[PDB]
């Protein structure tokens, strides 16, 4: 009942990336580290703050050879309008994945079947596609981007050196 | 494999109606005739024209004791923004049902599991909750509101008089 | 649950077509646009007007490269008799499929098991056999032949200009 | 795999009887002897001399307390038109049952699934409902009405004669 | 439920034929037309007029290239003894198949499991082995040998000029 | 699958008994010792010898409070015919049960499915319905009535005498 | 469940045979007529009489090309002990098969699950392995060796003489 | 797989006890401590020193309120004969349970299905019927009666002062 | 697949708590906020710092009406020994649950069957027993006790002001 | 339901052996006699005199070509700490296997699922891998190392002596 050391399934979906639409697949994720950033709904109040704080640390994540994929059950059409409507989302340089069919949310197991929306979940995945650490929060419980960056550095530190030791 | 004379299941969902949110359920539909108007996606190009033409005939449908429920796999949050963004949607006086979990689309059987979006489907339902006639079109094949009004009048004509005859 | 982008199954079928019996199969239907016009029963009062309306629009559908196939649970024998009895049916030029098996009605999912008669349903099908746009009416609710033509014109337009790119 | 001494299932069907449509059920059939006369198709290029032959002896069967029920997969609508077209069926006085849903044909096990038409089958049923003797022929192999009358007369002969019948 | 156009299964069985015992198989039946004449019991208090009546028409059935096969759940020992006891059975020239294991009666669906005896049934079968027409009568309801000949002639003339009646 | 100390199942069947047809049921058999004497077919060569040899010991079996029931897959009509056609069979006084539906043969597990004929099997059964001792022989292997009478006496002796050495 | 004309299954087992232990298998039994003589328990009262009565007819059975195999759920160790403890059992010359695992009793369907003891059952088996004729008796019902010898002679007579009347 | 703290199933069986036959049941075993001493065969060429050795310690086991139950797949007839043949078995005063039906051996899981004999196994059981400790040895691997007594004393002193070692 | 808004199952459990053995059950856990702090193994180098960090924040979590429950697959005997051996563990005031059954690890879905050891996971649970917010780290990736406190503070805030109405 | 003459399944586990961690597998175990010594828990308030008693006789077992493998559900980490804490385990020279995932305990069927701890169980296994004799005790019922040595000595005695052993 956990996804630690589980490979990403084969998938393809629409995305929104720097003012235009693209098609992201499993092949595009391999090679770099990756953070899947699930969130409940577009045109919401709490979500923009979480996405906006992930943008601030996106350059630092880029520096650590890590891509960011924000995921919602909204379509790629809706993401574009959300970027136009709110300046916080317009500042987002990372790719915003669309998941209307729910393949991702169901694979990662973060879909609320009643609401039809993804939980506030985050997943750190290695370049080989293995899930290394993750977090699930219920709606209303906001996240901390700094901690999410720390986990990635911590996991990269263990990936490079086989035998970790305390100071 | 058809829904003629099938009762509506018990359900409850969020809606967008005259600039504010409400909760529509199966009880709210009973008593009047009803047209469920499924469409693929908000912030789209073809959809507004179909919804805008349903608005033009909404007063005439109101006159025939019939409510209109537009359905999409988008959230009620997204419908509000779509009304603000585009004047055609802002003119819509009828309730726009949200179906992110897909309960409606799956019940009526109009969900494309690949796309995660509803087909261009329309359903005419009697006041007792029985499905009387319906239409499913694939994406890109637009609808005609006039024909959809004709079917409702035609079905109401048969509902009132038990033995129909040709001229 | 819906039938969109489902291909026609393999089937053979007896039909009355323009004063003569023939055998239609899936191969004869493929290669050109198809309209499947289901209707409840021969020798009824409400059916003739629908089938007649399609014949008025049939020559136009021939130009649009589309064949019409009327279908009901009656035998082919009954179609010939119905054509001889009434002028409306007698002028029908398109083929009249017979489905006493219910194989078509059941495939299209449009049979009323209680009555053993098909609903007033219309299916638009592409040359590849893919079901593209349809409607299902209860008994008593008639159809509008002009709408079928507009839907076929519309669904053809999309097929030419892939996925509504215009 | 035979129906001897099997009671009729409770059913209801439309019928053309004496220039008018009437519903027939087991209630109506029970209490009197009954012949169920199945045949392939109305408006057949094959001459319906079988139905005519049953009419010739129908008065005989009336006086033996036996009603005749012809059955095919055609509708009651098709029966009426057949009577109006040909004099042979026009003179039919016994009820003509319609079995478009296969209800009766399937119960008796006389439906050819491939053509959707009943075989040339005759069943003699008692007032109590028990099937006493029957006959099943392929399409093209015609029947003899006088033979059916003989079987009825014979089955009645035994029906009365309980005692001193190889007890 | 319906044995029309069903091929004869593979079997062998004992039989009494014109004073001696033989072994009849499915192979021996194919090539000519065949009438399977089932009956309930040898040494029956009910005089076997049915069997004697078939004998009167046997010479005629031979000229129509058809063999007669009487069938009963009695043994072949009993068939011979029954012929030696009564003239009617002593004049029988067609083979009398014994079915103590019930393989024929069960295949044709004519066995009464309670009594362990065959119903008064008659099956007409083609040279290819296809069952073309049949009748099943309750115990005590006699048959008409003439009518079986009529059915065979009808079946044969349809076989001679099949699928070409009224161009 | 030894079938010993299994109770006789509930049934009814037709029989030919001393120039008359009768309906024998389980309740008629119960209350007294019984021997079910299965045989393959009426109007055969070996069967009458065996059945005749049982009739010679029938009066003794009756004195020992035991009834005989001969059983085959032939009907009761055939039993009557075989009785007044053959002298040996006409002399028999015990009930000749018919088993055309094969209920007795199947329950005793003595039916040859190929033939649809019972094997040459003899079953001793107590008054309580309990199957006590039996034999099953192939076709062509004749039986000995004396031996069967001996086995009844042994069964009855054991029934009465408990704690015997 | 009549078991006639069923072939003997493939097995091996221990046995005590004339003052010595042996391993008997199916292949040793095949090629000649055989009688499997089941009995409930060693060191009992009725069993030795029956086994002794078989030894009196063993030389004849041997002349008729038939071997006897007595069988019980007792081990081969117990057979040896019973042989040199009892005079009747010491005199026996045929193989005494042991069936502690119950494979023979279960296959012949002759095991009483309550006791874990075989019934008094005798099975005649042809050289080809085919079970031809048998009897199954309850505990306390003794057998007759003469009758069993007669049934062998009958079985052998039928085997040779085809189309006999 | 593990019989620790499993209650004795309900059973009755024959047994040899000090010159006479008795009937031992589960009821008779409860109330006192119990040792079930399984062994492969009576009249074994392997001298039954194991059984004789248990007898030497029997008087001691009686004073510890424990009964000894030797178990074997041999009958009770054989138990008596084996006692009359050899002094070691003739000096046995504890009951010798016969298990020809294998119910005990199968329950304890000690039967060798191939040979049909019990392994050299010993089970210690409480007055409540709970299996407290046991051993299972292959054929040819002998046992030590002293060590079984040690196990019982250990089990009893734990039972006397249970769940209160080192407060 | 996730465990959000799933109630604690009924269970009993041995624990070492502040220099003494006790028996914790579901009833003792309910009625106040719970943090379940899973960790791989006693007598390891990476675990002490995490458990020690929680003890530093434990008094603050007591004020917030939240109890901490450390869990691993070790026995209760091993927890006492680990407390005696190292000072970091010796100062632990919160109860240390033992899970040699794996009943907790399996319920929380956080056991590594290969190693038979729990992942570095933290579960926040409400007084009603509903799981509210959690995280699952692979072996080797440590945690931040401050974040757990912020999440508990955050999840409590929502619980007071129903469904984020502020 | 017993393990006599069952081969060890192929496995691998961590172990504390002679002041260091080493992996152990069937490869390492095969080729020599083996004793698997299961015990409930490290750091038990119960004195581990059993492990000490095995060490006292370990040199004896070394010279009989037999390695000792102690097993519990504790980790290898816990074994090392137990050796550093108490002198009794500090003197242990034989390998101490760790079974935190229950792999070994479940195979031998000696795991108490309710406590998650192995019973006081001892298994004697041959160089070929076959389990020759074993012992299972409840918690609290202690063992005797000298008895285990005796069983090994006995099982080896038979192992060599193939011929003239009740063949």
How many domains in all of chain A? 1
Largest interface: A-I, 34 and 35 residues
Strand content of chain A: 25-35%
By DSSP (H or I, 4+ residues per run), the number of helices of chain A equals 7
Order of helices and strands of chain A: EEHEHHEHHEHEEEEH
Q: How many whole angstroms does the radius of gyration of chain A measure?
A: 15 Å
CATH class wording of chain A = Alpha Beta
CATH arch. level architecture of chain A:
3-Layer(aba) Sandwich
CATH topology value of chain A = Glutaredoxin
The strand line-up of the biggest sheet of chain A is 2-1-5-4-3-8-9
Number of strands of chain A: 9
The chain-level structural class of chain A is alpha+beta
Helix fraction of chain A by DSSP (H/I, runs of at least 4): 25-40%
The N- and C-terminal alpha carbons of chain A lie at a distance of: 33 Å
Q: Tell me the major beta sheet of chain A.
A: 7 strands, mixed
**CATH level-4 homologous superfamily of chain A:** Glutaredoxin
Quaternary status of these chains? homodecamer
| Envelope shape of chain A | globular
């Amino acid at each position: 009942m956990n996804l630690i050391n589980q490979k990403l399934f084969d998938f393809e979906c629409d995305a929104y990336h720097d003012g235009e639409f693209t098609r992201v697949s499993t092949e595009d994720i391999l090679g770099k580290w990756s953070i899947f950033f699930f969130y409940p709904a577009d045109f919401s109040f709490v979500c923009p703050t979480e996405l906006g704080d992930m943008q601030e640390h996106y350059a630092h994540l880029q520096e650590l050879n890590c891509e960011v994929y924000s995921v919602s059950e909204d379509s790629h059409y809706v993401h574009k309008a959300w970027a136009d409507a709110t300046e916080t989302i317009g500042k987002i340089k990372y790719p915003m994945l669309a998941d209307p069919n729910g393949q991702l949310a169901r694979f990662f197991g973060v879909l609320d079947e009643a609401s039809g929306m993804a939980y506030r979940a985050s997943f750190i995945v290695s370049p080989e596609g293995d899930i290394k650490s993750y977090e699930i929060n219920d709606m209303g419980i906001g996240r901390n981007a700094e901690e999410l960056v720390r986990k990635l550095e911590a996991s990269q530190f263990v990936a490079e050196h086989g035998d970790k030791v305390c100071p």
